[PDB]
Design a protein around this ligand. Structure first.
Ligand SMILES: O=C(CCCCC1CCCCC1)N[C@@H](Cc1ccccc1)C(=O)O
Ligand SMILES: C=Cc1ccccc1
Ligand SMILES: [Cl-]
Length: 454
């Protein structure tokens, strides 16, 4: 039994001022590098323990001992994501009900149905880049976010955000991005009831109202038309939970749509951006991935079956998730009094944070080359220790979108590697912006067309 380390304190504010930064996850990674596999983090009226080693995280991933916790970040996001799948407690009726109803929508009949709409958006991205002039560059995270938002809009509720037709966001997205910014900014406020935050509070309620008004209109319009699209909204309007026999109510469907749009905007776009970053920084890996794309993608339009054959592209995506997991943390609570690692006694209700980027750098798991981008690490899942790789979280509360995201990302990256050569023309220095998620900021490349028709 030993005392865990704690980073530097600021009197009555304890550790809170350490998160007064635009890059708090990267700050917590530096603290983990200094203090090791576990540290205490205290703020006024709150304690969490940050875990970084596979040794402790394999225990934390035991669902008999620990359940998903809503981090303060998720509690603030719940003001607009409500009891949707990501901001619900496991014990809330609406978690298991929505999980049971939505699981068939997210399976590997389900990706075959979504494939054609994913191709529609992927083709828009390829045509955009084919149409750039010689002296122009690609803003990578910007274009990847246009793609992933458009894909979830089409697959979510048959709606075209038309992101490739715009410089300026759709009004829903203005409010969504501003609500996500307020939720994350609220984490670093020592005195949140200070009148200096009154405007922030008013704007937040306005953005919540905008998202609720616009999503509630989508649901009403669909019910009125009777239209039966192969989309998540149709599955949610028609689906019955096999346990209760009940469908979701319109309020919960609204929270699920808001949840899916947040995920679609924030997560897959980061993965694609980091994957292209690592490929241009590792030209031998880019060549091996481009050779696979050329051999497999023999038709103008990729098929579902061809995307499943892009094995090396899948490994590239897993190795990008290893080094920069775009959703970089998840939170757990102790279901009962328990001892972590034979060393750290926890009381029922005690909170843990899994620092996924630090887990993914455990040299006792990955070896001395842990900072190197080597997709071959993922050739054999049986050679990877248990709970070493957690970019989609854990257990029954793991990402329901994992297959959807990896299908979209594999399709798009395959088509990108088929259609273009890439140049890191600025020798880009990685700068990671933190919203809900991690994305390269300012990452630009030049694409040279291979002139292969669509
Ligand atoms: O670890 C963090 C900061 C990065 C979370 C990032 C996380 C948010 C969900 C999507 C995945 C990434 N926050 C903890 C501790 C805390 C609590 C209150 C005030 C300040 C810090 C929390 O949100 O509980
Ligand atoms: C962890 C991913 C996530 C996805 C949507 C909303 C909040 C969090
Ligand atoms: Cl102090």
């Amino acid at each position: 039994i030993k005392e865990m380390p704690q980073p530097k304190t600021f009197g009555e504010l304890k550790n809170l001022p350490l998160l007064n930064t635009d890059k708090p996850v990267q700050a917590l990674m530096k603290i983990a590098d200094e203090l090791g596999e576990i540290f205490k983090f205290e703020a006024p009226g709150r304690v969490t323990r940050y875990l970084s080693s596979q040794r402790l995280i394999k225990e934390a991933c035991d669902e008999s001992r620990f359940d998903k916790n809503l981090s303060q970040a998720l509690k603030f996001v719940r003001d607009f994501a409500g009891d949707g799948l990501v901001t619900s407690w496991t014990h809330e009726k609406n978690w298991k009900k929505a999980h049971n109803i939505l699981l068939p929508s997210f399976s590997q009949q389900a990706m075959k149905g979504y494939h054609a709409m994913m191709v529609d958006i992927a083709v828009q991205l390829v045509q955009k880049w084919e149409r750039l002039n010689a002296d122009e560059h690609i803003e990578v995270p910007e274009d990847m976010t246009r793609l992933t938002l458009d894909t979830i809009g089409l697959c979510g509720f048959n709606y075209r955000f038309n992101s490739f037709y715009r410089d300026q966001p759709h009004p829903f997205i203005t409010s969504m991005v501003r609500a996500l910014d307020e939720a994350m900014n609220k984490l670093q406020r020592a005195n949140p009831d200070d009148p200096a935050y009154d405007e922030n509070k008013r704007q937040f309620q306005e953005d919540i109202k905008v998202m609720n008004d616009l999503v509630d209109k989508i649901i009403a319009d669909r019910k009125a038309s009777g239209e039966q699209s192969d989309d998540l909204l149709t599955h949610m309007l028609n689906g019955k939970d096999p346990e209760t026999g009940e469908p979701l109510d319109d309020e919960n469907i609204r929270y699920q749509i808001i949840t899916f749009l947040i995920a679609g905007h924030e997560t897959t776009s980061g993965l694609l951006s980091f994957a292209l970053y690592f490929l241009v920084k590792n030209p031998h890996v880019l060549q091996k991935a481009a050779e696979e794309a050329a051999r497999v993608l023999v038709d103008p339009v990729p098929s579902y079956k061809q995307v499943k054959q892009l094995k090396y592209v899948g490994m590239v995506l897993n190795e990008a998730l290893r080094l920069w997991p775009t959703a970089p943390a998840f939170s757990l609570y102790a279901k009962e009094d328990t001892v972590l690692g034979g060393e750290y006694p926890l009381e029922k209700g005690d909170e843990l944070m899994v620092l996924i980027p630090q887990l993914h750098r455990d040299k006792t798991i990955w070896g001395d080359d842990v900072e190197e981008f080597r997709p071959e690490r993922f050739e054999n899942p049986s050679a990877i220790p248990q709970h070493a790789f957690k970019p989609f979280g854990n257990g029954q509360r793991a990402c329901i979108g994992q297959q959807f995201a990896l299908h979209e990302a594999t399709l798009v990256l395959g088509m990108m590697l088929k259609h273009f050569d890439f140049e890191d023309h600025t020798n880009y220095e990685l700068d990671i912006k933190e919203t809900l998620t991690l994305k390269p900021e300012g990452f630009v490349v030049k694409a040279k067309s291979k002139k292969i028709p669509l």
